[PDB]
Each structure stands twice: as C-alpha cells, then as structure tokens.
C-alpha cells in the first residue's frame, strides 16, 4: 500500500516559510497534489519526473492557512491525505539592505554590510541566515556596529581578485520578538586593486599607493588641534563632484563654534562622522605645513579631483601621528580599527 509523507503535519501552526513544502510517495507514485490558501488560490508546484516528489515552486506567505491534498497510486492500493496548516504570523517585518552593490568592484578595505530597517533582537539568527562565499576562500566573521547593521570581513585586507557572494536568506526566519524578514537578498562583488593612502601629521602629506607604488603625493591640511583628525584606518565610501557639508547633519549646529556650512568640490567620504578628502582652495598655503580644518583632509583642487578619479569605494586611508584619538570602530567606515580577536569573537550576545 502506498505511503505518503509531507514536510508539514496536519494541524501544524507556525510553519516557517523559509523552506518549500514537499510531499513524497513511497511504494507508489503521486497521482495528484494540490495546495491552496485560505482564499482558495492554488499554489505553484512541480512534480518530479519519477513521480515520487512534489514541492511548491513559489515562496509561501505569512499569516496564511494552506490546505494540501495528495493522492498516491500503486499496484497494491491507493492512499489519499488532506493536510491543513497555518504559517507563522509575524509581529513585525524588516527588510535587509546589502552593500556593496551587485557587480561592484571595490577596494581591499570594503567589508560586507547587511543593514536592516528594524532593531534585531536575535543577532545569532541573522548571522545564521547570511551565507558568505569567498574565492580564494578566506576566514571572516560577523560584528555588529549598531542594532540594525552587521559587518563581515577577514582579519587582513582582502586579496585583490577575490570574489565575494552574499546570500541573505532572511525570508521566513524569525529574527526575534516576532520580527521576521521581509525578503531575501543576493549580491556579489569583487575586490580590485590595492589602494592605500597614508596621511602623516608629521609631514602633512597624503601619499596614495597603488599596489605598493607611490603614484601621488598630496600636501594636505588636516584637523586643527581643537577639532583634530583621528588616527587609524578609514574605508573610502561615497564620492561627490560637489557636496554641501552641513555640520548639523552630525548634531553640531551651524551657528555653534564648531559648526559650518560650506560647499566643496571633489569630496570623497572616508568616515561617517564627516571626515572627507576634498578640494580646499582656501588653504593651499597651509597645506603641507599646518592644520586648519574641522577634520577633513584639505587638499588642492587638482589633487582632490585626482583622488575622486583614482580612488574607489573600499580603498583605504590611514592617518597617523595626529593629536587626535583613534577612529571609533563602530563609526561605520572604521571597521578595521577593531582588533581582529575582538572582531572574530563577535558581539552576538
Ligand atoms: Na490564516
């Protein structure tokens, strides 16, 4: 007599939709399989050529009730089952967003970033749902900067030519306190040339190195003693032909002593706290000699444009020997300032 198996049991509740629903016939073949929702709408599925396995072919829905009818035939006899089950009903939904973009070529400092639009009560579940693939394979780990964003990077800077695949399979996954993922995301990026630029407060020079060779030496003016540029490793972020810098976006009023509202050209972002490489005609004389800025690396127009043209997202800017501290690891572009052993251990709780 044919036997029927299913990936769900009749009367089940909280069936997660991260996996498809299957039905298997033993000692026989599947003659008919149908699955409809509470409204009577049929679900897409495909039967295997051998007739032994049937699986849904489209993702299932939240807060739904599904009814499954299966018939199995064989030389001996026939068997029919009806199964109804309710999927999980999330309390809230959160959509993930992944950087860098699909197909992008990025520098050796670009981490993998998964940002959610809600606080994540169960970080371990989120890390479990994210699969990272590297070629050549290299060790990495997760670390959380705030409650909504997590990062993945190796111990050392990426090796150029490394392929990276990010599968955020959070759909159907309970991320804590009834917070389920809105969808799945799949992005892929590649590591380009090694580009490391160093800013030494002693020489007041920003040197750009491509694959270990000096290609540009830029005299610069960094943060003055009152508002210094922090030392450490910076990841290059967004680039702007021109951008109005407003201190108020960082909580500093414009009318305050340290506030400002200045329009600059050829601005490359290297920290979330507002540190940029940008064109500063007004300080070309100070550049290479004294620090006079709020934190940004002031350089000449031609050098700023050159930086814009030859530096890509993920490249590195390291600052040393300034009177400031060290760029916070939680900044958003300061991932590499966290010691490896701390990063490796993670903060999943
Ligand atoms: Na329902």
Author numbering: 59 to 407
Pull verbatim passages from the article behind this deposition.
The l,d-transpeptidase LdtMt2, which is responsible for the formation of 3 → 3 cross-links in the cell wall peptidoglycan, has been identified as essential for M. tuberculosis virulence. The extramembrane section of LdtMt2 consists of three domains, two of which have an immunoglobulin-related fold, and the catalytic domain which has an ErfK/YbiS/YhnG fold. The LdtMt2 active site within the catalytic domain is bordered by a flexible loop (residues 300–323), sometimes referred to as the active site “lid”, which creates two entrances to the active site: the inner and outer cavities. The Ldt mechanism is proposed to be analogous to that proposed for the PBPs, although employing a catalytic triad analogous to that observed in some cysteine-proteases, involving Cys354, His336 and Ser337, for the formation of the cross-link between the donor and acceptor stem substrates.
A crystal structure of LdtMt2 reacted with cyanamide 31 manifested covalent modification of Cys354 with formation of a carbamoyl group, likely resulting from initial formation of cyanated cysteine followed by hydrolysis. The carbamoyl group was directed towards the oxyanion hole (the respective distances of the carbonyl oxygen to the backbone nitrogens of His352, Gly353 and Cys354: 3.6 Å, 3.5 Å and 3.1 Å). Further polar interactions were observed between the nitrogen of the carbamoyl group and the sidechain of Tyr318 (3.4 Å in chain A) and the backbone carbonyl of Gly332 (3.4 Å in chain A). In certain cases, this was accompanied by an additional modification of +17 Da, which likely reflects the addition of water to the transferred nitrile group to give an S-carbamoyl cysteine residue. Interestingly, in some cases we observed hydrolysis of the S-nitrile group to give an S-carbamoyl group, as validated by crystallography in the case of 31. Of the LdtMt2 inhibitor classes identified here, the cyanamides 22–36 are of particular mechanistic interest, as they are electrophilic agents that cyanate Cys354 with high inhibitory potency.
